[PDB]
């Protein structure tokens, strides 16, 4: 029986790609697969784009049921002490938007094929999914994890060096993705238009809340804001602040962000070139 060749499409989206592959592998007689022409970096961008579309859709419809007057995501109930220090390069910020957290905990790094760490929300996230295993959050994260596993099983199969090997795990990963997509697409379909706020990644943080933050918390915010194509009111607020900048500077000059992979040297440079701009 001839093993089918997984190929990556002209510009087709992750879901179509999976639909395609699941079809090829469900064909009769197949008992192996050729992952030689699969570019894992491109597969990761492809999945990440889809995750981004989903996470964006969740925000627009406010599937999170976020009340306009809270400056915090719904994970707050599952986290104190709430250390204000950095945890594997990030500090807990209670003001993270749910869709950003969702993207953080599930985006596959095209270079390393791991996740860029977002440690302060791993436990509250897990805790949430336990109390609310049918929650929209739990469903999105589950679709997310499902997509990750497809890439995982392919990278595994793409290796060589083992016993045998063997496929049903891949087959399942593909079908589990489809299923979870069904539930996600169904949640999304129910349609209050979209509510906007005055920074990209966080709910509105007031001056008093912001002057209570540690340097690590503040630097975490700055590093996050640089992911946006335009300077934010929030990051400008912080860099404009003389007192806030002091905390930001001596955290930047620490060791808590050494291991960060989001172009940390370059971001530190942007932040400095932006303080000068603003004082």
């Amino acid at each position: 029986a001839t093993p089918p060749l997984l190929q990556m499409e002209q510009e087709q989206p992750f879901p179509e790609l999976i639909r395609t592959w699941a079809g090829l592998l469900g064909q009769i007689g197949v008992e192996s697969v050729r992952t030689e022409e699969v570019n894992f970096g491109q597969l990761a961008k492809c999945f990440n784009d889809y995750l981004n579309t989903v996470a964006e859709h969740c925000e627009q419809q406010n599937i999170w049921q976020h009340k306009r007057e809270e400056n915090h995501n719904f994970f707050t109930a599952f986290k104190p002490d709430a250390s204000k220090a950095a945890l594997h390069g990030h500090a807990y910020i209670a003001h993270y938007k749910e869709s950003v957290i969702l993207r953080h905990l599930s985006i596959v790094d095209p270079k390393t094929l791991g996740m860029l760490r977002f440690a302060p929300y791993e436990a509250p996230s897990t805790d949430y999914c336990r109390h609310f295993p049918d929650s929209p959050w739990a469903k999105m994260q589950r679709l997310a994890t499902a997509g990750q596993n497809i890439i995982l099983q392919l990278r595994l199969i793409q290796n060589g060096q083992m016993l045998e090997d063997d496929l049903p795990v891949l087959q399942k990963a593909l079908d589990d993705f489809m299923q979870y997509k069904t539930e996600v697409d169904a949640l999304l379909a129910h349609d209050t238009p979209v509510s906007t706020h005055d920074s990209s990644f966080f709910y509105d943080i007031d001056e008093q809340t912001l002057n209570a933050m540690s340097g690590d918390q503040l630097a975490t915010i700055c590093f996050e804001e640089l992911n946006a194509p335009h300077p934010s009111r929030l990051i400008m607020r912080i860099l404009k602040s003389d007192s806030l900048w002091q905390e930001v500077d001596d955290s930047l000059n620490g060791d808590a962000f050494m291991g960060r992979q989001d172009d940390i040297c370059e971001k530190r440079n942007k932040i400095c070139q932006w303080r000068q701009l603003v004082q």
Partner: protein, 170 residues
């Protein structure tokens, strides 16, 4: 190609050092890259032991719950499992109870286990004393070691101890 083939499992909380330990064993390097392992990863290391050539198929797992079903496949068929905690992280120590339960649930009944307290180079941040860990490990007939992936302490000894124990179970 080999006399034996030992499947090894690294399990334990997120961020306690499983991927770092495995990197110190396989390549003798250490890096601080904040990258979380997704699902599983593996490495292969043929070692010679008491005259016999042993292949180590070592599985690095993810510690976070969404990946639990994905890692669980690897508990069955594992010859030895290393349960890892962070000596600066009381919670990750507490969770060793919960990891030993996943071993019951999914792994064979004769698996060799090893308890390992990582990041032991953080000496002023250590909240889990050696005695409390040792006593717990001893109560189970389970070996215990305090390792440092960063300063290369006991990392070799942990895997070689575990390979020796599995070989002895013949």
């Amino acid at each position: 190609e080999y006399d034996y083939l030992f499947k090894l499992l690294l399990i334990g909380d997120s961020g306690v050092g499983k991927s770092c330990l495995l990197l110190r064993f396989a390549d003798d390097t250490y890096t601080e890259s904040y990258i979380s392992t997704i699902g599983v990863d593996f490495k292969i290391r043929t070692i010679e032991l008491d005259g016999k050539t042993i292949k180590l198929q070592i599985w690095d797992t993810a510690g976070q719950e969404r990946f639990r079903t994905i890692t669980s496949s690897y508990y069955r068929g594992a010859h030895g499992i290393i349960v890892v905690y962070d000596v600066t992280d009381q919670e990750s120590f507490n969770n060793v109870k919960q990891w030993l339960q996943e071993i019951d649930r999914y792994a064979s009944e004769n698996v060799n286990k090893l308890l390992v307290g990582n990041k032991c180079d953080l000496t002023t941040k250590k909240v889990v004393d050696y005695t409390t860990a040792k006593e717990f490990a001893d109560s189970l007939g389970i070996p215990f070691l305090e390792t440092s992936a960063k300063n290369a302490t006991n990392v070799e000894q942990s895997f070689m101890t575990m390979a020796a124990e599995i070989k002895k179970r013949m």
